[model samples]
Target: RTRIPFNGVGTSVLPAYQTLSAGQYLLSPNQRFKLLLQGDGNLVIQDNGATVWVANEQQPFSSTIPLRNKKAPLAFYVQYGAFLDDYSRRRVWLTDNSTFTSNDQWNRTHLVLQDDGNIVLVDSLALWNGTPAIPLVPGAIDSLLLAPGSELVQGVVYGAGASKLVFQGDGNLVAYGPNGAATWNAGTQGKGAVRAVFQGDGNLVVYGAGNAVLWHSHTGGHASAVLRLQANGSIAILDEKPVWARFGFQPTYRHIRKINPDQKPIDIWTWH
Candidate 1:
């Protein structure tokens, strides 16, 4: 809930706008990334002081550059966009035509650096444009490991549906419902749990304090396996089939129990 004025400076806040004439820049919350409007009117994003991306490089604005919010006739409030204007107030370039709800939602619209070092403009709507600041190479393993003292968001699911899994900061891996109710969990709370990883082998494994495997999805060894957090607020492994899923869904309890008898039994609900 911080206000970032277009006063030619950047901070760990939303609406961080800078007028190229002021020579100020926007820095990511972590301070690992920077966005600046060059004197030549080129918008550039740098990583650790190394230029990684540029906007309007081929068509850099030549005169005085003034970045301003999109305004409309008879409008009494600021709008939801930032664009560069030339000395004559002529529209030279625009960031994007994407739109979003203003007010609190507008406040929610901010820039973030992903774990892979990709800068993303995210909000309640969608990504603004293309070319991530520093795009990850193809075939990069973007696995999830819930490190200690950290929690993953609901949007980090794999597949589509309510099958969403989150690693709670309380050392528990819980599956939440569409309504944000805990439907299932690993029950590894307070056991010195450090992290959980969705391995490429279609296994959702939890590690203990000493990096020991605390719990895991016994569904492994299938080709092209993927662990997806379904839209139903549940989790499933789609390899050869729905190898493992929520208690009441595919790969019935009896079927899994028969396979991995030594594993702890999951809480099964009676489907009406």
Candidate 2:
């Protein structure tokens, strides 16, 4: 693994971290893609020196911040690409694209660049259309992004029946039953987000703006989960106790309606 200094350029393995000062940058192995931390404090991904993606592009940082792996309480241990205040932990800007986990040790996730110009994140159990599960595309440039962007075309699937889960490129994560009825949905239309990951802890999560959790499976207890695209186009989550099953089509739901304080109802779905 190549370690890129704060002011220099180099590539490192996925489990690596760096605390970059202003004007530092990291490069991919092929040198086609550059992860740059500009003097104005914007983290950008450039294609052959042309700007392709930006994080915190609207605002600039006042002082230097560190970009490394740190544990966020009860949430995640991420390889942070954050722009924080010099003295306090107050954040100025962040990628929100940090790898998250409840475990103390690092998880096994990595970034890959394809010959088709696609950057992807690969896993063995979670299957998608491409080699790496999540494929990032800007319509013109197709790659799998471990970083933040808009839309994750891989690992995001639509259940078409009891057996087949067809992967769609339109960023809709859904499950369908026999005769083409909807079972479950991420409700991710027009969110302009990217990257859907099957995490190590058995949850399939999609990340939206600032790497926030737009949707999740709510299944993270077992050591690992097996995701199977069923023959009828429905998806199944096989864990220790069969955590969740098909909700059936055309079900009515409520979100935080008036109820007695003594008995609270669970709200399963939320919107951004």
Task: Please give the lDDT score at residue 54 for candidate 1.
Answer: 62
Error (Å) of candidate 2 at residue 149 is 20
lDDT of 1 by residue, 1-272 (tens): 33333552554223324223425566653466676666654556788889887644352221234435455111101123334554333334443423333454444334433322333333322111111231211111122212122334423543223335667667787876557776667888888777777655545678886779888767545434444343344344432111111122222222221111533221111111
Error of 2 at 39 (Å): 83
Tens digit of per-residue lDDT, candidate 2, span 15-77? 223345455455553457766556554555678879876643353321233534444211111
Off by over 4 Å in 2: 1-163, 240-272
In terms of lDDT, the poorest run of 10 residues in model 1 is 136-145
Prediction 2 TM-score vs. true: 0.29
Each prediction's whole-model lDDT (CA): 0.42, 0.39
Best by TM-score: 1
lDDT of 1: 0.42
